[PDB]
Amino acid sequence: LANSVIDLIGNTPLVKINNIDTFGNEIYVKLEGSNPGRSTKDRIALKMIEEAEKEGLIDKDTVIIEATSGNTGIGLAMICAVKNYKLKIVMPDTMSIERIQLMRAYGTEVILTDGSLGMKACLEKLEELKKNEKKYFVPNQFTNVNNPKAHYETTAEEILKDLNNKVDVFICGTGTGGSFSGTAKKLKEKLPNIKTFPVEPASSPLLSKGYIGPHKIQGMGMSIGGIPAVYDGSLADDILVCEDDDAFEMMRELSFKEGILGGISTGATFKAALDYSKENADKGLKIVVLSTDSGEKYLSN
Amino acid sequence: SLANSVIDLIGNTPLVKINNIDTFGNEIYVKLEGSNPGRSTKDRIALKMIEEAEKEGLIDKDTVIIEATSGNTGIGLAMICAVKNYKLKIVMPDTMSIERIQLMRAYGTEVILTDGSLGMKACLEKLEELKKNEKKYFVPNQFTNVNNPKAHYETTAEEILKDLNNKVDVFICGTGTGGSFSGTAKKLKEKLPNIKTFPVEPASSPLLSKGYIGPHKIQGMGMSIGGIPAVYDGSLADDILVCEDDDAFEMMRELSFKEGILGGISTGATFKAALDYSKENADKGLKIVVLSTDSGEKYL
Ligand SMILES: *Cc1c(COP(=O)(O)O)cnc(C)c1O
Ligand SMILES: [Ca+2]
Ligand SMILES: [Ca+2]
Ligand SMILES: [Ca+2]
Numbered sequence: 001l002a003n004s005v006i007d008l009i010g011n012t013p014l015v016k017i018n019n020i021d022t023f024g025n026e027i028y029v030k031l032e033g034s035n036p037g038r039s040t041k042d043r044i045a046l047k048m049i050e051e052a053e054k055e056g057l058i059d060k061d062t063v064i065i066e067a068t069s070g071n072t073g074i075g076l077a078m079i080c081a082v083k084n085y086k087l088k089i090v091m092p093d094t095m096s097i098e099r100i101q102l103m104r105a106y107g108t109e110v111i112l113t114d115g116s117l118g119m120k121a122c123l124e125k126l127e128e129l130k131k132n133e134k135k136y137f138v139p140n141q142f143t144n145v146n147n148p149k150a151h152y153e154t155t156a157e158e159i160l161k162d163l164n165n166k167v168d169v170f171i172c173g174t175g176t177g178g179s180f181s182g183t184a185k186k187l188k189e190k191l192p193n194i195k196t197f198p199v200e201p202a203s204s205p206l207l208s209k210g211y212i213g214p215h216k217i218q219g220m221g222m223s224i225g226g227i228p229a230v231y232d233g234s235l236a237d238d239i240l241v242c243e244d245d246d247a248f249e250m251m252r253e254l255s256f257k258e259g260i261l262g263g264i265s266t267g268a269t270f271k272a273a274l275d276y277s278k279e280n281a282d283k284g285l286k287i288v289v290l291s292t293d294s295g296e297k298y299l300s301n
Numbered sequence: 302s303l304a305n306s307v308i309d310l311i312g313n314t315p316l317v318k319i320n321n322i323d324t325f326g327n328e329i330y331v332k333l334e335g336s337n338p339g340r341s342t343k344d345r346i347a348l349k350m351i352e353e354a355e356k357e358g359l360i361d362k363d364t365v366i367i368e369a370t371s372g373n374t375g376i377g378l379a380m381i382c383a384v385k386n387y388k389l390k391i392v393m394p395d396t397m398s399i400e401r402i403q404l405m406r407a408y409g410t411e412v413i414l415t416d417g418s419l420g421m422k423a424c425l426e427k428l429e430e431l432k433k434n435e436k437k438y439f440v441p442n443q444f445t446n447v448n449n450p451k452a453h454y455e456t457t458a459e460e461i462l463k464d465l466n467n468k469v470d471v472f473i474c475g476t477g478t479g480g481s482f483s484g485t486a487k488k489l490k491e492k493l494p495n496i497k498t499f500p501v502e503p504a505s506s507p508l509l510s511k512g513y514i515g516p517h518k519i520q521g522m523g524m525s526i527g528g529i530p531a532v533y534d535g536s537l538a539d540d541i542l543v544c545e546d547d548d549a550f551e552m553m554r555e556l557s558f559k560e561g562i563l564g565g566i567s568t569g570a571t572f573k574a575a576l577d578y579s580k581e582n583a584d585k586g587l588k589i590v591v592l593s594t595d596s597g598e599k600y601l
């Protein structure tokens with residue numbers, strides 16, 4: 001028994017890749033789409049809220065307000081439904097409409113900004129919304145230590161446990177950089193020789209080339225006007241990248257060949273990992289790819 | 302939770318207690334079959350129908366799998382066939398959610414549509430033409446295949462018994478084929494002779510309770526193949542429950558708003574029926590289990 005869907009967060013499965021040729025290394029995909037909110041962000045939504053509760057920052061009538069590209073908003077929405085908190089989300093209008101529909105299904109109010117202005121415009125709009133709220137809490141996933149800490153505490157421990165501490169490589173897409181940075185930090189503490197790589201959009205190559213651009217890999221990319229505080233670049237053994245169309249193609253390869261329905265970022269991160277495996281062919285490496293969300297919410301794209 | 306493929310993730314779904322919605326002094330637990338990798342309970346029957354046919358020698362590498370479905374059985378089959386590299390063709394009514402078509406095609410399925418005003422019977426008729434064009438095929442036929450209710454008899458029911466430590470008073474389940482209801486109820490009644498088990502049908506297509514069919518919006522429920530499916534066992538039903546379309550939608554929204562449970566339309570219908578039942582039997586301390594057949598994302 002679970003007492004609520006909150007008890008279903010985490011403990012997600014790790015699936016081996018069987019049909020796609022992985023070049024003499026083993027690739028495992030951690031399916032964060034299995035979380036009740038259908039993304040890894042359920043983990044950070046839960047920890048950011050639970051820690052704020054313990055700190056006395058959230059009353060029953062505190063309005064939670066967050067800027068998000070979607071999944072953190074969905075995770076927060078689901079948790080706020082269970083907890084009976086009021087949530088307002090600011091999101092760009094360029095993200096999948098299914099994100100809006102999911103948040104609204106849980107009772108969350110959505111405020112939209114012009115997506116050509118990036119997540120920075122969301123953060124600016126949130127400042128305006130604060131002026132009309134008597135009592136609020138902003139989780140601020142871009143700076144809140146409880147974003148990477150959630151992954152340090154749970155995501156990484158699950159990887160270590162499921163693979164019996166045999167992990168050579170970990171690869172993860174980045175937006176805030178929290179899932180990469182928190183997970184890689186714990187993995188590196190327990191497995192000093194592991195290699196950990198973040199992925200970013202080839203069309204918004206902030207970490208690899210120093211500039212941003214428009215791209216279609218929803219959830220990835222850094223558009224707040226700098227590198228998020230929760231990203232820890234010292235953990236990156238290299239920066240990997242993926243083109244928009246390659247990300248979409250790999251998403252369909254995964255569903256056609258493995259029955260794995262992941263999001264666009266999963267396609268991007270997996271493509272990067274498969275390229276890495278090919279470059280490192282026949283080494284018998286155990287490579288773990290984080291699939292951030294499931295692919296259901298991208299049928300409209 | 303290391304898995305060799307998504308097939309290993311089928312089953313062992315969670316039972317969640319309802320805590321915010323008023324359940325009238327009984328405990329209601331929802332079995333969340335949306336947690337399956339294909340997002341419905343039909344993953345269980347897709348897996349058993351295919352695995353049993355493999356063992357029988359009815360599926361070779363070049364055998365085309367052909368099935369009529371309202372969606373979820375097709376999605377389950379598609380995900381399993383993707384892993385196993387079998388060619389799948391599905392016939393579905395054009396009145397079901399477009400997300401069903403997109404999901405099945407994502408897994409590589411060829412999806413053929415029939416006019417939904419004609420019901421599932423039209424899908425079954427269309428299967429005849431598809432059979433003529435294939436040298437090797439297997440039709441799982443969820444409406445007649447005992448491996449549909451047997452999957453639930455073997456796994457779903459045992460998970461319910463295990464998770465509640467054999468303390469279950471009432472089981473309530475929506476019907477389309479009748480397989481999930483009939484398989485699960487059969488096992489539960491073999492182990493718990495006092496348990497009450499109820500199927501739910503759409504109030505506006507009350508075939509079992511009133512002997513006629515009609516239009517409804519509770520996708521996945523209802524019987525439109527031209528009679529009662531062979532896998533439905535009406536001797537297990539302690540009564541026939543129903544739900545109206547509007548109430549099913551309202552309850553779907555109540556579940557997501559108040560419990561953070563995003564279930565399909567049939568989950569709203571089945572849950573509303575269980576709530577009504579619980580209200581009529583208020584304050585008896587009954588342990589009521591409701592099967593939530595699928596998750597709600599495909600209805601957006
Ligand atoms: C198939 C289905 C049903 C009916 O289940 P049976 O076990 O075939 O009676 C109910 N709800 C949904 C969402 C379904 O896909
Ligand atoms: Ca150490
Ligand atoms: Ca290093
Ligand atoms: Ca390209």
Ligand SMILES: [Ca+2]
Nearest residue numbers: 323324325326
């Ligand atoms: Ca009462």
Ligand SMILES: [Ca+2]
Nearest residue numbers: 353356357358
């Ligand atoms: Ca035999």
Ligand SMILES: [Ca+2]
Nearest residue numbers: 383386387409
């Ligand atoms: Ca195929």
Ligand SMILES: [Ca+2]
Nearest residue numbers: 389409410411
């Ligand atoms: Ca195909």
Ligand SMILES: [Ca+2]
Nearest residue numbers: 545546547548
């Ligand atoms: Ca009504």
